[PDB]
Amino acid sequence: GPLGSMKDILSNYSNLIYLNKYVKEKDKYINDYRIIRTLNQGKFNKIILCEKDNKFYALKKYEKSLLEKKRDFTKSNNDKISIKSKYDDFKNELQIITDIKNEYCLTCEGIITNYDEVYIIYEYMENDSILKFDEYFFVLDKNYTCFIPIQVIKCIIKSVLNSFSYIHNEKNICHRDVKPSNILMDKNGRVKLSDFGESEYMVDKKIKGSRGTYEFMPPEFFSNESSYNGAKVDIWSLGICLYVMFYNVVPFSLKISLVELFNNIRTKNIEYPLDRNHFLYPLTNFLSNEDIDFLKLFLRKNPAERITSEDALKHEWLADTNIEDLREFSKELYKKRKKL
Ligand SMILES: NC1=NC(=O)C([C@@H]2CCNC(=O)C3=NC(Br)=CC32)=N1
């Protein structure tokens, strides 16, 4: 149960670098990585775009002294209350990051620390996330409202599935937070699963839940079960990601107030119209039977009836996948970002 000190966790890491910040002229460095701008601030960590050798990198900053103060209740097994700081959570996130090595997952290239401040060195995925959220999901702009073409979606889904194969099957890790935010894309254009901050190791293929992002949580979480199968949880979440990719919106879980949310998921049936339906009125093409055939296999309420990562991978939908679809999109999308 109890993980040790950070030192004990990183005691087996082979590329642990000693923290050295410094300032040369108007520029701020972290071990030769020049600080450009912060790409995204998640208020448990920030992600920093950096430069070293005419190459771009992305360095996830964590801070022990800031994280150990944030302390929520968890309630133990034994009546007597237990407390867990968000730093405890990071201890587990480290261990995980420390052993992800995969071409479909975001793998770190080295960890920089002084045992308080941590910087995790990742490759820079020039196209940020799969989609960006602001009152709704969009590709590039709020004024330009484009839908990711289906021929390209396939790749994205195929690519993440492969990630799933590695974390579930090779590593025995459940992601527990599959989200457009965490599905990252470069210019070339590969797609890699990232962010392991809710991830944990499975026990006989299962997890102990009520943790992640509410609209991406499976119906199981709303039964009297305590152990849910980890793989299928990730799969459901990918289903939501697909739904989001389809109609650029969250399913029945349309935010506003969240009792409506938690009371719907477990029993309410998902409506499957044609792309712009949900998105028409905050502005004032579409899809086929086969498209929904695949998404429904993902979003089945009973998880045992829900499609495996195995069956999904070898399905008729992804049979006609072409990486040239993802390549052109990613290369063109990158062209539009450069000066935006
Ligand atoms: N949730 C996230 N965990 C992460 O490690 C990231 C990264 C770091 C990987 N590389 C990049 O280039 C990124 N661009 C953007 Br936006 C975010 C990220 N996000």
Q: Which of 74, 93, 124 is the last residue of a domain?
A: 124
330 and 203 in a common domain = yes
* Beta bridge partner(s), residue 301: none
Q: Report in angstroms the alpha-carbon separations of 217 from 74, 89, 128, 251, 307.
A: 19, 19, 23, 12, 16
3-class DSSP assignment, residue 48:
strand
Ligand 1, residue 60: give the atom nearest the CA.
5
Closest residue CA from atom 1 of ligand 1? 195
In the numeric block, the tokens 């499975």 are attached to: 202
Residue 40 CA to its chain's centroid (Å): 13
Ligand 1, residue 122: give the atom nearest the CA.
9
Enzyme catalytic residues? 177
221 and 115 in a common domain = no
Q: Report in angstroms the alpha-carbon separations of 330 from 15, 89, 130, 157, 188.
A: 31, 34, 10, 15, 6
Ligand 1, residue 123: give the atom nearest the CA.
10
Ligand 1, residue 126: give the atom nearest the CA.
12
Q: Which of 124, 150, 173 is the last residue of a domain?
A: 124
Report residue 96: phi and psi, to 5°.
Answer: -70, -55
Q: Residues before each break in the chain (C–N > 2.5 Å)? A: 284
Q: Which domain holds residue 82?
A: 1-124
Which among 244, 240, 241, 230 has a CA at the least distance from the CA of 199? 230
Distance 268 CA to ligand 1 centre (A): 34
Edge-to-edge strand ranges of the sheet holding 46-52: 16-18, 110-113, 117-123, 55-63, 46-52, 33-41, 27-30, 21-24
269 and 140 in a common domain = yes
* Continuous segment of H or E residues that includes residue 111: strand 110-113
Q: At what angle do helices 289-298 and 230-247 cross, to 10 degrees?
A: 150
137 and 36 in a common domain = no
Distance 269 CA to ligand 1 centre (A): 34
Taking the alpha carbons at both ends of the chain, their separation in whole angstroms is 47
Closest residue CA from atom 3 of ligand 1? 195
Q: Are strands 227-229 and 137-138 parallel, antiparallel or unpaired?
A: unpaired
134 and 66 in a common domain = no
User: What CATH number corresponds to the domain at position 50?
Assistant: 3.30.200.20
Number of structural domains in the chain = 2
> What is d(CA 242, CA 264) in angstroms, rounded to the nearest whole number?
19
Six-digit token pair at 205?
């293929």
User: What CATH number corresponds to the domain at position 206?
Assistant: 1.10.510.10
Distance 167 CA to ligand 1 centre (A): 18
262 and 166 in a common domain = yes
Which among 124, 137, 139, 133 has a CA at the least distance from the CA of 47? 124
Distance 53 CA to ligand 1 centre (A): 20
Of 96, 184, 193, best ligand 1 pocket probe by most atoms within 8 Å of the beta carbon: 184
Residues 6 or more apart from 270 whose CB is under 8 A from it?
Answer: 243, 251, 252, 296, 299
Confirm if 68 and 85 have CB atoms less than 8 A apart: yes
Report residue 84: phi and psi, to 5°.
Answer: -135, 115
> What is d(CA 76, CA 90) in angstroms, rounded to the nearest whole number?
19
Distance 124 CA to ligand 1 centre (A): 7
Ligand 1, residue 40: give the atom nearest the CA.
16
Residues 6 or more apart from 321 whose CB is under 8 A from it?
Answer: 154, 155, 158
Residue 261 CA to its chain's centroid (Å): 21
> What is d(CA 76, CA 84) in angstroms, rounded to the nearest whole number?
10
310 and 174 in a common domain = yes
38 and 143 in a common domain = no
Q: Which of 89, 124, 159 is the last residue of a domain?
A: 124
Confirm if 28 and 34 have CB atoms less than 8 A apart: yes
> What is d(CA 312, CA 129) in angstroms, rounded to the nearest whole number?
23
Residue 230 CA to its chain's centroid (Å): 15
Six-digit token pair at 52?
């070293």
Pocket of ligand 1 (CB under 6 A): 39-40, 47, 58, 60, 106, 122, 124-125, 128-129, 182, 184, 194-195
Closest residue CA from atom 15 of ligand 1? 128
259 and 155 in a common domain = yes
164 and 77 in a common domain = no
Distance 47 CA to ligand 1 centre (A): 6
Six-digit token pair at 37?
């701008």
188 and 171 in a common domain = yes
Confirm if 35 and 119 have CB atoms less than 8 A apart: no
63 and 158 in a common domain = no
Six-digit token pair at 204?
């006989």
* Sign of the CA dihedral with 212 first, then 213, 218, and 220 last: positive
